[PDB]
Coordinates of N, CA and C in Angstrom, one line a residue:
Chain A
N1 N 10.1 -11.0 4.2 CA 11.0 -12.0 3.6 C 10.5 -13.5 3.6
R2 N 11.3 -14.4 3.0 CA 10.8 -15.7 3.0 C 11.8 -16.8 3.1
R3 N 11.7 -18.1 3.7 CA 12.6 -19.0 3.8 C 12.2 -20.3 3.8
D4 N 13.0 -21.3 3.7 CA 12.4 -22.7 3.3 C 12.1 -23.2 4.6
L5 N 11.3 -24.1 4.5 CA 10.5 -24.9 5.7 C 11.7 -25.9 6.2
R6 N 12.0 -26.1 7.4 CA 12.9 -27.2 7.9 C 14.1 -27.0 7.4
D7 N 14.5 -25.6 7.2 CA 15.9 -25.3 6.8 C 16.8 -25.4 8.2
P8 N 17.9 -25.9 8.1 CA 18.8 -25.8 9.2 C 19.3 -24.7 9.7
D9 N 19.3 -23.6 8.7 CA 19.7 -22.2 9.1 C 18.4 -21.7 9.6
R10 N 18.5 -21.1 10.9 CA 17.2 -20.5 11.4 C 17.4 -19.0 11.3
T11 N 18.3 -18.5 10.7 CA 18.5 -17.0 10.7 C 17.3 -16.4 10.2
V12 N 16.9 -15.2 10.6 CA 15.8 -14.4 10.2 C 16.2 -13.1 10.0
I13 N 15.9 -12.5 8.7 CA 16.3 -11.2 8.1 C 15.3 -10.2 8.8
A14 N 16.0 -9.2 9.3 CA 15.2 -8.2 10.0 C 14.7 -7.1 9.0
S15 N 13.6 -6.6 9.1 CA 13.0 -5.7 8.0 C 13.1 -4.2 8.6
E16 N 12.8 -3.2 7.8 CA 13.3 -2.0 8.0 C 12.1 -1.0 7.9
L17 N 11.9 0.1 8.9 CA 11.1 1.0 9.1 C 11.6 2.3 8.9
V18 N 11.4 3.0 7.6 CA 12.0 4.2 7.2 C 10.7 5.4 7.2
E19 N 10.5 6.1 8.1 CA 9.5 7.4 7.9 C 10.1 8.5 6.9
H20 N 9.3 9.0 6.2 CA 9.7 10.2 5.7 C 8.9 11.5 6.0
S21 N 9.4 12.7 5.4 CA 8.7 13.8 5.8 C 8.7 14.8 4.6
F22 N 7.9 15.7 4.7 CA 8.1 17.0 3.7 C 7.8 18.2 4.6
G23 N 7.6 19.4 4.1 CA 7.4 20.5 4.8 C 6.5 21.6 4.0
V24 N 5.5 22.1 4.8 CA 4.6 23.0 4.2 C 4.8 24.3 5.0
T25 N 4.7 25.5 4.1 CA 5.4 26.8 4.6 C 4.3 27.8 4.3
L26 N 4.1 28.9 5.4 CA 3.4 29.8 5.1 C 4.2 31.1 4.6
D27 N 4.0 31.6 3.5 CA 5.0 32.5 2.8 C 4.4 33.9 1.8
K28 N 3.3 33.9 1.8 CA 2.7 35.1 1.1 C 1.6 36.0 2.0
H29 N 1.4 37.2 1.5 CA 0.5 38.0 2.0 C -0.3 38.7 1.1
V30 N -1.5 38.2 0.6 CA -2.5 38.9 -0.2 C -3.3 39.8 0.5
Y31 N -3.4 41.1 -0.2 CA -4.1 42.0 0.4 C -4.7 43.1 -0.8
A32 N -5.9 43.7 -0.5 CA -6.3 44.8 -1.3 C -6.5 45.9 -0.4
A33 N -5.7 46.8 -0.5 CA -5.7 48.1 0.1 C -6.3 49.4 -0.7
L34 N -7.3 50.2 0.0 CA -7.8 51.3 -0.4 C -7.7 52.4 0.5
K35 N -7.7 53.6 0.0 CA -7.8 54.9 0.7 C -8.9 55.9 0.3
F36 N -9.4 56.4 1.2 CA -10.5 57.6 0.7 C -10.5 58.7 1.5
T37 N -10.3 59.9 1.0 CA -10.4 61.1 1.6 C -11.9 61.3 2.2
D38 N -12.0 62.1 3.5 CA -13.1 62.2 4.1 C -14.3 63.0 3.0
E39 N -13.8 63.8 2.1 CA -14.4 64.4 1.1 C -15.2 63.3 0.4
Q40 N -14.5 62.3 -0.3 CA -15.1 61.4 -1.1 C -15.7 60.3 -0.4
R41 N -15.4 60.0 0.9 CA -16.2 59.1 1.8 C -17.7 59.4 2.1
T42 N -17.4 60.8 2.4 CA -18.9 61.6 2.7 C -19.6 61.8 1.5
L43 N -19.1 62.2 0.2 CA -20.0 62.6 -0.9 C -19.8 61.6 -1.8
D44 N -18.9 61.1 -2.3 CA -18.5 60.3 -3.6 C -19.1 59.0 -3.2
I45 N -18.9 58.4 -2.1 CA -19.4 57.1 -1.9 C -20.8 57.0 -1.5
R46 N -21.7 56.1 -2.0 CA -23.1 56.1 -1.6 C -23.4 55.0 -0.9
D47 N -23.1 53.6 -1.4 CA -23.3 52.6 -0.8 C -21.8 51.9 -0.6
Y48 N -21.5 52.1 0.7 CA -20.1 51.7 1.1 C -19.8 50.1 0.8
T49 N -20.8 49.2 1.2 CA -20.6 47.9 1.0 C -20.7 47.5 -0.6
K50 N -21.5 48.0 -1.4 CA -21.6 47.8 -2.8 C -20.4 48.7 -3.5
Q51 N -20.1 49.5 -3.1 CA -19.1 50.3 -3.8 C -17.6 50.1 -3.4
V52 N -17.3 49.4 -2.3 CA -16.1 49.3 -1.7 C -15.7 47.8 -1.3
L53 N -16.6 47.4 -0.4 CA -16.2 45.9 0.3 C -16.4 44.9 -1.0
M54 N -17.5 45.0 -1.6 CA -17.8 43.9 -2.6 C -16.4 43.9 -3.7
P55 N -16.2 44.9 -4.2 CA -14.9 44.9 -5.1 C -13.7 44.4 -4.5
Chain B
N1 N -10.0 -50.3 -28.9 CA -9.5 -50.7 -30.1 C -10.6 -51.2 -31.0
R2 N -10.2 -51.1 -32.3 CA -10.9 -51.5 -33.5 C -10.4 -52.8 -34.2
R3 N -11.1 -53.9 -34.6 CA -10.6 -55.1 -35.3 C -11.6 -55.2 -36.6
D4 N -11.0 -55.7 -37.6 CA -11.9 -56.0 -38.8 C -13.0 -57.1 -38.1
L5 N -14.1 -57.0 -39.0 CA -15.2 -57.9 -38.3 C -14.7 -59.2 -39.3
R6 N -15.3 -60.3 -38.6 CA -15.0 -61.6 -39.1 C -13.4 -61.9 -39.5
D7 N -12.7 -61.4 -38.6 CA -11.2 -61.5 -38.9 C -10.6 -62.9 -38.4
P8 N -10.1 -63.5 -39.3 CA -9.3 -64.8 -39.1 C -8.7 -64.9 -37.6
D9 N -8.1 -63.9 -37.0 CA -7.5 -64.0 -35.8 C -8.3 -63.3 -34.8
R10 N -8.5 -63.9 -33.4 CA -9.3 -63.4 -32.6 C -8.7 -62.8 -31.3
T11 N -7.6 -62.3 -31.4 CA -6.7 -61.7 -30.3 C -7.4 -60.3 -29.9
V12 N -7.5 -60.0 -28.7 CA -7.8 -58.6 -28.5 C -6.8 -57.9 -27.5
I13 N -6.6 -56.6 -27.9 CA -5.8 -55.8 -27.2 C -6.3 -55.3 -25.8
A14 N -5.6 -55.8 -24.8 CA -6.1 -55.6 -23.4 C -5.6 -54.1 -23.1
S15 N -6.6 -53.1 -22.8 CA -6.2 -51.9 -22.3 C -5.9 -51.8 -21.0
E16 N -5.2 -50.6 -20.5 CA -4.5 -50.4 -19.4 C -5.2 -49.3 -18.5
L17 N -5.3 -49.4 -17.2 CA -5.8 -48.3 -16.5 C -4.7 -48.0 -15.5
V18 N -4.1 -46.8 -16.0 CA -3.0 -46.2 -15.0 C -3.6 -45.0 -14.4
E19 N -3.5 -44.9 -13.1 CA -3.8 -43.7 -12.4 C -2.7 -43.2 -12.1
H20 N -2.6 -41.6 -12.3 CA -1.5 -40.8 -12.1 C -1.7 -40.1 -10.9
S21 N -0.6 -39.3 -10.4 CA -0.5 -38.6 -9.2 C 0.4 -37.4 -9.4
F22 N 0.3 -36.3 -8.5 CA 1.3 -35.3 -8.3 C 1.2 -34.9 -6.9
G23 N 2.4 -34.4 -6.4 CA 2.6 -34.0 -5.0 C 2.2 -32.4 -4.9
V24 N 1.6 -32.1 -3.7 CA 1.4 -30.8 -3.2 C 2.5 -30.7 -2.0
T25 N 3.4 -29.7 -1.8 CA 4.3 -29.7 -0.8 C 4.0 -28.3 -0.2
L26 N 4.1 -28.3 1.3 CA 4.3 -27.3 2.0 C 5.7 -26.7 2.2
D27 N 6.3 -25.8 1.7 CA 7.6 -25.6 1.5 C 8.3 -24.4 1.7
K28 N 7.4 -23.5 2.2 CA 7.8 -22.1 2.3 C 7.5 -21.4 3.6
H29 N 8.3 -20.5 4.1 CA 8.1 -19.7 5.3 C 8.1 -18.3 5.2
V30 N 6.9 -17.4 5.0 CA 6.8 -16.0 4.7 C 6.8 -15.4 6.2
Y31 N 7.7 -14.4 6.3 CA 7.8 -13.8 7.6 C 8.2 -12.2 7.5
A32 N 7.7 -11.6 8.6 CA 8.3 -10.3 8.6 C 8.8 -10.2 9.9
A33 N 10.0 -9.6 10.2 CA 10.6 -9.5 11.5 C 11.1 -8.0 11.7
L34 N 11.0 -7.7 13.0 CA 11.5 -6.3 13.3 C 12.3 -6.5 14.6
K35 N 13.3 -5.6 14.5 CA 14.1 -5.5 15.8 C 14.3 -4.2 16.4
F36 N 14.1 -4.0 17.6 CA 14.1 -2.6 18.1 C 14.7 -2.7 19.4
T37 N 15.8 -1.8 19.7 CA 16.5 -1.6 20.8 C 15.6 -0.9 21.7
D38 N 16.2 -1.1 23.0 CA 15.4 -0.4 24.0 C 15.3 1.1 24.0
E39 N 16.4 1.6 23.3 CA 16.1 3.0 23.0 C 15.1 3.3 21.9
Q40 N 15.2 2.6 20.8 CA 14.2 2.5 19.7 C 12.6 2.6 20.2
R41 N 12.6 1.4 21.2 CA 11.3 1.3 21.6 C 10.8 2.1 22.6
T42 N 11.8 2.8 23.4 CA 11.3 3.8 24.5 C 11.1 5.0 24.0
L43 N 12.1 5.5 23.1 CA 12.0 7.0 22.6 C 11.5 7.2 21.1
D44 N 11.5 6.3 20.2 CA 11.3 6.4 18.8 C 9.9 5.8 18.3
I45 N 9.3 4.8 19.3 CA 7.9 4.4 19.1 C 7.2 5.1 19.9
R46 N 5.9 5.6 19.2 CA 4.9 6.3 19.7 C 3.5 5.3 19.9
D47 N 3.2 4.7 19.0 CA 2.0 3.9 19.2 C 2.2 2.3 19.1
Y48 N 3.2 1.9 18.1 CA 3.5 0.5 18.1 C 2.5 -0.3 17.7
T49 N 1.3 0.1 17.3 CA 0.3 -0.7 16.6 C 0.1 0.0 15.2
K50 N 0.0 1.3 15.0 CA 0.0 1.8 13.5 C 1.3 2.1 13.2
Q51 N 2.4 1.6 14.2 CA 3.8 2.0 13.8 C 4.6 0.9 13.5
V52 N 4.3 -0.3 14.1 CA 4.9 -1.5 14.1 C 4.0 -2.7 13.5
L53 N 2.8 -2.9 14.1 CA 2.0 -4.1 13.7 C 1.4 -3.9 12.5
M54 N 0.9 -2.8 12.0 CA 0.2 -2.5 10.7 C 1.3 -2.6 9.7
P55 N 2.3 -2.0 9.8 CA 3.4 -2.2 8.6 C 3.8 -3.5 8.5

C-alpha cells in the first residue's frame, strides 16, 4: 500500500497472504497381459524376448 | 533584436534573463504490512522467510 508523507493519520493497512492448492491423483492401471500354453511356449516361441517382451 | 541600419531613432530593446525553476518533492510512503496472531505465527507459519519476508 501507499500513504502520504507526514500524514496526521498514521494508520497502516495490513496486507493479506492467501495460499492456494490443487490435487494430483493416481487413477489408472495400464497393462499388457499375455498367456501361452506350455505347448506353444516350448514349440511356437523361438526368441521369447524378441517375440514377446519387446511387443 | 533587429533594427533598421541607419535608423533615425537609436533606442535598443534590452533583453531579459529569467531563470526558471521547478520543485521535486518527497511525498509518498510505500509500505507492505503484515499482522500475525500468536496462533498464526506459532501454528500456521513454517519458514517466515519464504512465507512472510519474500512476499
